[PDB]
């Protein structure tokens, strides 16, 4: 009474794709009816209270089973959940109802949520991104090109003043942004309020110098919800265009009250994807990143870490930027998702890239993305200021070559070496980070 194949999904309904590995001697029908039941109005026994409420209308049910090719006791399950049973404008409930305790079931060894479709009716209740891509470019006055960020190294050690100067030299060369590390909060060695005051002196300095709008992501992530709002009251007070938060670690409810506040005040929020690798790593167990990416877009967020490069990564990148995306099973997308005019989230590329990966990342990610160099700028032979001008000239070279109409897959190593002739700073960096 949970497994019903004949059922045809409605438009106002949330649909999910589960990769199921049952215990041997367990049929393909019963283990499918058990996760469809245990997520929504499911109980191990028949109880008398089920005859007063209408169970047929509310119940989630499995309508389609597809066996995974070249895999034994491995098949894809399609379950449909009526729209009414979830609360309005809360990721916390949709997360809680579906993927609650269907995991760690005795009937099955391994379980993995692959994808999740949102009907448009449900999409409307949320705020979504406080700004989006189109809005964000307009506040910063930057067009044509991918935006350039920088992570200060080392992660923990520097004083509040030393942090303030290491940030000053980087934006001076010609970086758009600078970034705080994901584990710096209110460490004893540098308190947050001191770090917040010295970074304020270095942005105004390099702003009046180069003559461009500069920024720095001020990590706001705090243990309690008072502290978080109170730290943010101070960033608004020093006229900071951007701050940043880790959503997975603080929780969805922490991330929610923030985004409402951020739309209230017109500050752009960066989101780091800290602690992602423990859930989405295993191909048999966990939840796929694309589910969490949607959940982020809906919670709200102007930027998001996507990870560096392939067929799978462009699946959930075009899923966060485009208004309408089509079902493509090879890419990794199981359902047709339609966003109701909701603004797009900008892709952030960070983690071990130098001036030779420069042709590869402008072509794949395109124009609406942020390129972030942790080790690639500071570790320049000549310091932070020459290391910045190195990465700036190398981006602008590939963007000019692309417009005129050159393939950057073919002439990728060619444009970097021409540019290396008239600029001294790129000649010493081409030498160091070789092939």
């Amino acid at each position: 009474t949970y497994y019903t194949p004949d059922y045809t999904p409605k438009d106002t309904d949330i649909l999910a794709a589960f990769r199921v590995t049952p215990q041997p001697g367990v049929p393909f029908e019963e283990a499918a009816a058990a996760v469809a039941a245990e997520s929504s109005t499911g109980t191990w026994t028949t109880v008398w209270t089920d005859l007063l409420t209408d169970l047929d209308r509310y119940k989630g049910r499995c309508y389609d089973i597809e066996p995974v090719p070249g895999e034994d006791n491995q098949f894809i399950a399609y379950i449909a959940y009526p729209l009414d049973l979830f609360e309005e404008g809360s990721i916390t409930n949709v997360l809680t109802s579906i993927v609650g305790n269907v995991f760690g079931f005795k009937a099955l060894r391994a379980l993995r949520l692959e994808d999740i479709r949102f009907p448009v009716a449900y999409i409307k209740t949320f705020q979504g991104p406080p700004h989006g891509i189109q809005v964000e470019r307009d506040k910063l006055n930057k067009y044509g090109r991918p935006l350039l960020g920088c992570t200060i190294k080392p992660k923990l050690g520097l004083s509040a003043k030393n942090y303030g100067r290491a940030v000053y030299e980087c934006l001076r060369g010609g970086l758009d942004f600078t970034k705080d590390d994901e584990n710096i909060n209110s460490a004893p060695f540098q308190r947050w309020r001191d770090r917040f005051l010295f970074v304020a002196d270095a942005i105004t300095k390099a702003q009046a110098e180069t003559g461009e709008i500069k920024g720095h992501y001020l990590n706001v992530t705090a243990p309690t919800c008072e502290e978080m709002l109170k730290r943010a009251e101070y960033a608004k007070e020093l006229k900071q265009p951007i701050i940043m938060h880790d959503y997975l670690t603080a929780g969805f409810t922490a991330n929610t009250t923030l985004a409402r506040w951020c739309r209230d005040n017109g500050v752009l929020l960066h989101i780091h994807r800290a602690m992602h690798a423990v859930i989405d790593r295993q191909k048999n167990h966990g939840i796929h990143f694309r589910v969490l990416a949607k959940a982020l877009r809906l919670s709200g967020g102007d930027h998001i870490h996507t990870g560096t490069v392939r067929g799978i990564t462009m699946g959930f990148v075009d899923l966060l930027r485009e208004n309408y995306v089509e079902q493509d099973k090879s890419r990794g997308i199981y359902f047709t998702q339609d966003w109701a005019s909701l603004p797009g989230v900008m892709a952030v590329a960070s983690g071990g890239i130098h001036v030779w990966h420069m042709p590869a990342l402008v072509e794949i990610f395109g124009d609406d993305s942020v390129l972030q160099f942790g080790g690639g700028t500071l570790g320049h032979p000549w310091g932070n200021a020459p290391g910045a001008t190195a990465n700036r000239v190398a981006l602008e070279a590939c963007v000019q070559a692309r417009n005129e109409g050159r393939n950057l897959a073919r002439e990728g190593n060619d444009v970097i070496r021409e540019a290396a002739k008239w600029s001294p700073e790129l000649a010493v960096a081409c030498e160091l980070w070789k092939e």
């Binding site: 004949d6 999904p9 209408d54």
Partner: protein
Amino acid sequence: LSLETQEQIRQILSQGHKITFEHVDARRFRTGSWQSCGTLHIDAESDAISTLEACLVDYDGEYVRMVGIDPKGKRRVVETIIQRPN
């Protein structure tokens, strides 16, 4: 079985879609709570007209309606009420 009924039957099955027919008594129509009657995912005209005359008679004094279902994921394309209660 009207001329509107068999053209929609033919329009549904000319798309590669499958037909499902559904009935409802007057009370549960309030809440839009219909049910399947006969054989689901119908892919030919004669199976459609036979179980249409089975369900017009099996649930006379109820609503009866025909569904055009795209077999790709079982997606609901077109909904049309054929029979209404007296």
